[PDB]
Design a protein around this ligand. Structure first.
Ligand SMILES: C[C@@]1(c2ccccc2)OC(C(=O)O)=CC1=O
Ligand SMILES: *[C@@H]1O[C@H](CO)[C@@H](O)[C@H](O)[C@H]1NC(C)=O
Lengths: 339, 56, 218, 292, 226
């Protein structure tokens, strides 16, 4: 009966990890940051509105220059916007219209998209002779593609619904490393600022910190009660925020190995679809299912503003690398640039 | 079955044997970092409209 | 501004092409096909003629789009909102699988999936076209085996007409919103025709209900 | 008695009962009509989200009904004073052109609505159901032009004739000649009635040929198809039948005695007041009686 | 690649044709820059993507006409009245305009034919010592400032190797064209612009042209032969 012995050992071992977690909990984030002055009410005006999509918008990603952004929609079109003049630089027709993610290469010569076809496709924007054409179709996943992020011009990390992430090589199209350990579908991921680690949110209410090089999970985080819909890294790199389906946000710290503060209100019962941080990390913008975006004071866990300008569910969020704007997409086929 | 349980147990021991710091030590870094970039945040502190790339 | 004015007319040339594709896509009928794997969905597809399977067929100058999600094997809730907006949902259930087990028999597995897909919060007004395939294999099996293995509360003769009508009644009983959506039930033979016609008739009623919504009558 | 209007043997009456019945009847049409059509205009402009081809036509019908309502206070004073126009010459023609161009405008923008509903039920896959918001705007302006072009003759007429010590402003006077305005008044009913009845009968028959009447909301829509057909006949047949009788008396008896027309002339102007009944019931029947 | 053109005629008319090949010709705006036997380049005409806005040089406004045929990927130029002032080699240049694009990147082979206000770019320097291995700077000047309010100075640097078509080195103030070695550099001040070369190779000889793109009646700088 080694199965029962192993199960008992895991429960005892998990108790030891839990015992060490509360031992280091000397204080709380709210208690420490109670003396700080609030950021005050924040009002963001719609500085721009981008039209041209004819279906629900599922994902967008800001360019590294903080001027271009790529938006993915379910009508089969990938559109690159000039966020300063609303100009459409490119319009990429996709083979499959069921796309749930889009990524922008840090160099800017590539974009990626994927979805229910279980294939991540890389498109060449440089196009030395002609227009934008596909470059590689990274097949090998078993479930739907839920997120994808570029590490460089030749490496991309993709998380799918088959409970396993992966690290690809664009030149050969082979899975360099496969990450396993999740018990549910992986719905999002966020690369570290130093591009050495990343965190993945799954449907089992757990976020796991991976290592790109070694390929083994380093830490696990619990505290959510429903599916984690979106994850994002703190700009420092020693924390991250998760958005689950129980209408709550949590800020986990990579060194304390435990949740620090929670961002919940009694008025909101709708789950969070997207989260993002400001340039300094003081503001935690979260997109909800109740047709508007919210701004949270990450250091005091107090509501500080509402970006109510959408007539449908907000499905994606983005903050420029410069930090001077916020673009929020939604299912009403509209993108809006705020402040 | 046994190997899968052994793999989970072996991986679980790796997370237990890690170096942890107090929350107050960790929360101090988050507060110190936020005031290190307090003035460099356009969203927290609005900049003059002349420097806005989207207003005009 | 010389180069900027040329960049604006490029965006406008992109805009006029986006509308042209959107007009073409709006004139197509999107359907969703579901089943229990070996329920005859492949058999149904032939009559109307990894990842997602897309099928194209036309009938009476109407272009249909069929999507098969039988190879996903993932959490249905996380990607079911993508199909919210299809004209109709096609459900395939094999009547011959009332005694085969996957435990629990395969028929109750079909009923469990039908209960969730019909009562989904995203599908509250989409018509469901229910296809009961394998009627030839079901009519011979009832002679040698009763229906009591499937439904223990069954009380009737072991004849095709009575047994077939009881299974249809059990599947329609799972419809909780009896006043908002209509469930179309058809009995599909292994080698038969007019099944694409049954979809055309059911889809037309959806378009009429859609057209009246623009005019405000319905 | 007898009057001459442009070399035409015409009989004009000034009955006492006109003052006692018509300003009451016309009073209730304006006071709620301003609230009925006016409030419906507010929702159409500052509370709607998506504009489609069907909503554009209902807007043109709404604005046509609103303009007819503001004619009533000018109409009512002519009735309280017992056919005594004290408003001038040019205003008299304006209150006759814009009172008649509106009524044909409202009639035109409900056959279009009836035809619009016919194509959305009997031919659901027809290309006419997917016209853009521009093609409806072109059609609405084109239908306005033919409406105006069929009543421009009213403006060129010097109407404020002298009736003894009274000024008579009226485009519907009993005259023994063939006039286009009299013919146009008849065609305002007989032609649209055929299209409305044909479109309303085919819609309900088709919605019952295929078993769609079991749905609760389809039953709600089916009844309102009869309602728009019932209201149209109720609000427009009484005036037409009397006018047909007037055309009969002219042929058999003539203008040699202007006494047989005493009863019908009073009746005709009372029944003509039911033509503004339709412009009152339209906001309730057409716009306020929808799920949206 | 692209090629095609007309031949010699006496004072008559001729139709110039270009044959695009494998670069998605339907989404490229094409020019018709021409170069006389011994002078610098001179812009002639332009037709945008989708045959939209069309511009002509002041000297060929009434006589010339430019049109494109997106199927079969062919560009046309029809000249009606032809004088002795317009004998030149007619080059075909492609150019696409979006946010980060590089116009005038590829130049056609060009064909010759014999018949038997605006912005002025000076480029005063006309001859430079040709010794290998030196760091040479080529200067330019403009009548009015090219620094648009957008923040980018529209100035393009072209190199014409002896016997071949012009090739784009630098587009706008400092951006380096694709395939150009990083030795070339470009800096300007809105009115005065310089092109810097670190180490001259044996393939760096030729005529260097500067072109503005602020106002569409655009002019070149007559070149500075090394
Ligand atoms: C009774 C009448 C009128 C009377 C006085 C001033 C204006 C209009 O209304 C009409 C009409 O509905 O067109 C014709 C008329 O003679
Ligand atoms: C009016 O009637 C008189 C006699 O009844 C007749 O002489 C005259 O011609 C008639 N006028 C017209 C215009 O018919």
């Amino acid at each position: 009966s080694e199965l029962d012995q192993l199960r008992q050992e895991a429960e005892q071992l998990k108790n030891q990890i839990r015992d060490a977690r509360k031992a280091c909990a000397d204080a709380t984030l709210s208690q420490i940051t109670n003396n700080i002055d609030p950021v005050g009410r924040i009002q963001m005006r719609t500085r721009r509105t981008l039209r041209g999509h004819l279906a629900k918008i599922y994902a967008m990603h800001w360019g590294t220059d903080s001027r271009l952004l790529v938006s993915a929609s379910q009508d089969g079109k990938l559109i690159i916007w000039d966020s300063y003049t609303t100009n459409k630089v490119h319009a990429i027709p996709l083979r499959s219209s069921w796309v749930m993610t889009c990524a922008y290469a840090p160099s800017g010569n590539y974009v990626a998209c994927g979805g229910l076809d279980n294939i991540c496709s890389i498109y060449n924007l440089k196009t030395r002779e002609g227009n934008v054409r596909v470059s590689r179709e990274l097949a090998g996943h078993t479930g739907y593609l839920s997120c994808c992020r570029f590490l460089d011009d030749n490496q991309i990390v993709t998380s799918s619904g088959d409970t396993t992430c992966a690290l690809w090589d664009i030149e050969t199209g082979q899975q360099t490393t496969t990450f396993t350990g999740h018990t549910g579908d992986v719905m999002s991921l966020s690369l570290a600022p130093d591009t050495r680690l990343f965190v993945s949110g799954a449907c089992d209410a757990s976020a796991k910190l991976w290592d790109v090089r070694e390929g083994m999970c380093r830490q696990t985080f619990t505290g959510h009660e429903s599916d984690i819909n979106a994850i994002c890294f703190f700009p420092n790199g020693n924390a991250f925020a998760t958005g689950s389906d129980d209408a709550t946000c949590r800020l986990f710290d990579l060194r304390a190995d435990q949740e620090l503060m929670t961002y919940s209100h009694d008025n909101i019962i709708c789950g969070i679809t997207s989260v993002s941080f400001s340039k300094s990390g003081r503001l935690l913008l979260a997109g909800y299912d109740d047709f508007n975006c919210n701004v949270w004071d990450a250091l005091k866990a107090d509501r500080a503003g509402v970006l109510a300008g959408h007539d449908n569910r907000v499905s994606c969020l983005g903050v420029t690398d410069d930090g001077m704007a916020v673009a929020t997409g939604s299912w009403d086929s509209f993108l809006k640039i705020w402040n | 079955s046994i190997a899968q349980a052994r793999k989970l147990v072996e991986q679980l021991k790796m997370e237990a044997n890690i170096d942890r710091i107090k929350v107050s030590k960790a929360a101090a870094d988050l507060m110190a970092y936020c005031e290190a970039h307090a003035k460099e945040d356009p969203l927290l502190t609005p900049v003059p409209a002349s420097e806005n790339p989207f207003r005009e | 501004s010389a180069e900027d004015k040329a960049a604006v007319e490029r965006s406008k040339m992109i805009d006029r092409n986006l509308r042209e594709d959107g007009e073409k896509a709006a004139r197509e009928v999107k359907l969703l096909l579901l089943g229990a794997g070996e329920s005859g969905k492949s058999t149904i597809v032939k009559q109307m003629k990894t990842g997602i399977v897309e099928t194209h067929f036309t009938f009476k100058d109407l272009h249909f789009k069929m999507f098969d999600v039988g190879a996903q094997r993932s959490e249905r809730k996380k990607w079911i909102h993508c199909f919210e907006g299809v004209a109709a949902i096609i459900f395939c259930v094999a009547l011959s699988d009332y005694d085969l087990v996957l435990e629990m028999n395969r028929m109750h597995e079909s009923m469990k999936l039908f209960d969730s897909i019909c009562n989904n919060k995203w599908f509250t007004d989409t018509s469901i076209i229910l296809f009961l395939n394998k009627k030839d294999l079901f009519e011979e099996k009832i002679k040698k085996s009763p229906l009591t293995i499937c439904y223990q509360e069954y009380a009737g003769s072991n004849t095709y007409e009575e047994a077939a009508a009881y299974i249809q009644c059990q599947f329609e009983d799972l419809n909780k919103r009896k006043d908002t959506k209509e469930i179309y039930t058809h009995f599909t033979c292994s080698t038969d025709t007019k099944n694409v016609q049954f979809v055309f008739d059911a889809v037309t009623d959806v378009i009429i209900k859609n057209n009246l919504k623009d005019c405000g009558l319905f | 008695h007898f009057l001459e209007i442009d070399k035409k043997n015409c009989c004009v009456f000034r009955d006492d009962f006109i003052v006692k019945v018509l300003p009451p009847v016309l009073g209730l049409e304006f006071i709620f009509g301003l609230l009925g059509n006016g409030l419906a205009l507010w929702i159409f402009c500052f509370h709607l989200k998506s504009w489609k081809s069907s909503r554009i036509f209902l807007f043109n019908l709404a604005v046509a009904d609103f303009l007819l309502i503001i004619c009533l206070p000018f109409l009512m004073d002519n009735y309280v004073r017992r056919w005594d126009w004290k408003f001038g010459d040019i205003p008299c023609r304006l209150m006759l052109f814009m009172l008649a161009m509106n009524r044909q405008g409202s009639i035109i923008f409900l056959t279009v609505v009836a035809v619009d509903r016919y194509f959305r039920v009997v031919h659901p896959h027809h290309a006419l159901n997917k016209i853009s918001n521009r093609t409806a705007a072109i059609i609405s302006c084109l239908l306005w032009g033919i409406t105006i072009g069929l009543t421009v003759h009213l403006l060129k007429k010097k109407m404020p004739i002298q009736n003894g010590g009274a000024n008579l402003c009226s485009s519907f006077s009993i005259c023994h000649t063939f006039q286009w305005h009299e013919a146009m008044f008849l065609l305002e009913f007989f032609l649209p009635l055929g299209i409305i009845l044909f479109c309303s009968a085919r819609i309900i028959w088709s919605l019952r040929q295929r078993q769609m009447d079991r749905h609760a909301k389809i039953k709600r829509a089916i009844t309102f198809i009869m309602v728009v057909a019932i209201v149209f006949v109720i609000c427009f047949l009484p005036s037409v039948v009397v006018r047909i009788r007037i055309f009969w008396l002219l042929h058999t008896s003539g203008t040699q005695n202007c006494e047989v027309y005493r009863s019908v002339d009073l009746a005709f102007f009372i029944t003509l007041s039911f033509t503004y009944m339709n412009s009152m019931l339209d906001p309730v029947v057409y716009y306020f009686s929808s799920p949206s | 690649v692209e090629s095609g053109g007309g031949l010699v005629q006496p004072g008559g008319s001729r139709k110039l044709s270009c044959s695009a090949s494998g670069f998605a010709f339907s989404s490229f705006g094409m020019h018709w820059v021409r170069q006389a036997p011994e002078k610098g380049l001179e812009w002639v005409a332009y037709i945008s993507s989708g045959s939209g806005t069309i511009y002509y040089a002041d000297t060929v406004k009434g006589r010339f006409t430019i049109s494109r045929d997106d199927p079969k990927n062919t560009l046309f130029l029809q000249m009606t009245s032809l004088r002795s002032e317009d004998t030149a080699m007619y080059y075909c240049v492609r150019s696409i305009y979006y946010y980060g694009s590089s116009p005038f990147d590829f130049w056609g082979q060009g064909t010759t034919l014999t018949v038997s206000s605006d912005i002025v770019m000076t480029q005063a320097t006309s001859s430079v010592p040709v010794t290998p291995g030196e760091s040479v700077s080529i200067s330019c000047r403009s009548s009015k400032s090219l620094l648009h309010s957008n923040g980018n100075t529209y100035l393009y640097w072209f190199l014409q190797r002896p016997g071949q078509s012009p090739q784009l080195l630098i587009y706008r103030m400092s951006n380096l064209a694709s395939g150009v070695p990083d030795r070339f550099s470009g800096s300007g001040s809105g009115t005065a612009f310089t092109l810097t070369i670190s180490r001259l190779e044996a393939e760096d000889v030729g005529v260097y042209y500067c072109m503005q793109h602020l106002e569409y009646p655009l002019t070149f700088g007559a070149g500075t032969k090394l």
